[PDB]
């Protein structure tokens, strides 16, 4: 028993982290097989990184300006091709330690682990959530660009996030490995505004089932609602809507606790309306929404 922010094992990825240097500009990149993916803003200078139009700058070719060192090995680059906001560099050796890997675009609220990497070496690993306003609140210093976010389903590693920028509000913005930014952000050195962020109701309901599994009962009540009745009190508190798709994803947790999803909604609705009453749940006086229903199942049932 117990619960915690339990990130995936990093090692499997530790193997696909390299350092890319374009001129004197250096950031990380992910090396799968005979190809290295990194953010397209390595080519720039400080002077270029305010409104750069990168199209021309890569047609300013020179494969030989692209330095990659993968630990001991000095990777030769044998190609230079740009897919949106990621550069995909052909290299001479295929990463011998390449696992099974997919690329997926995550929907807001879904979770991933991040390997914080600096100069192709990693300092630590943590778990993030995709904020409904397409931001991640992680831990990134300069040189973190090219750090990657991933989920491990069984054999396959899903790479969901590639880090690009810290915004003025202090949170983060990046891309899938197709260089397709989440949110309204660009590869430019300009303050950007995320939008408005919202608490993820399915994840809170996940975390409340989490508390139950570790023998916290103080929040439970003999009341229920409809989804309709819940969904107004959600809108009111800038809590996401809960749908039938959201109700279906919690069933495992319902089954294993024996509390019906709509009753837990009754518990969440009274918490929203009266506050956390001085008390903590899972040692947090704050509603936590950075645990997915899957992640509860995983952490509370190994895997």
């Amino acid at each position: 028993s117990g619960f915690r922010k339990m990130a995936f094992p990093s090692g499997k990825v530790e193997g696909c982290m390299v350092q890319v240097t374009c001129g004197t500009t250096t950031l990380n990149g992910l090396w799968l097989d005979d190809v290295v993916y990194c953010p397209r803003h390595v080519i720039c200078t400080s002077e270029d990184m305010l409104n750069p139009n990168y199209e021309d700058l890569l047609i300013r070719k020179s494969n030989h300006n692209f330095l990659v060192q993968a630990g001991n090995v000095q990777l030769r680059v044998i190609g230079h091709s740009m897919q949106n906001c990621v550069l995909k560099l052909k290299v001479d050796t295929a990463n011998p330690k390449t696992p099974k890997y997919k690329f997926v675009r995550i929907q807001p609220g879904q979770t991933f682990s991040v390997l914080a990497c600096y100069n192709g070496s990693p300092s630590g690993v943590y778990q993030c959530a995709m904020r409904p306003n397409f931001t991640i609140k992680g831990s990134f210093l300069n040189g973190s660009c090219g750090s990657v976010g991933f989920n491990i389903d069984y054999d396959c590693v899903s790479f969901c996030y590639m880090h690009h920028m810290e915004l003025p509000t202090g949170v983060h913005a990046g891309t899938d490995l197709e260089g397709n930014f989440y949110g309204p952000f660009v590869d430019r050195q300009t303050a950007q505004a995320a939008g408005t962020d919202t608490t993820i109701t399915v994840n809170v309901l996940a975390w409340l089932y989490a508390a139950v599994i570790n023998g916290d009962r103080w929040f439970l009540n003999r009341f229920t609602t409809t989804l309709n009745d819940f969904n107004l009190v959600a809108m009111k508190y800038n809590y996401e809507p809960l749908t039938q798709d959201h109700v279906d994803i919690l069933g495992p947790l319902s089954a294993q606790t024996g509390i019906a999803v709509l009753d837990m909604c009754a518990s969440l609705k009274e918490l929203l309306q009266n506050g956390m009453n001085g008390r903590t749940i899972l040692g947090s006086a704050l509603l936590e929404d950075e645990f997915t229903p899957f992640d509860v199942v995983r952490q509370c049932s190994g895997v």
Binding site: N142, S144, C145, E166, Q189
Partner: peptide, 10 residues
């Protein structure tokens, strides 16, 4: 402001 190169932590 994007993580390289603004060295002096942003």
């Amino acid at each position: 402001x994007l993580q390289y190169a603004v060295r002096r932590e942003x």
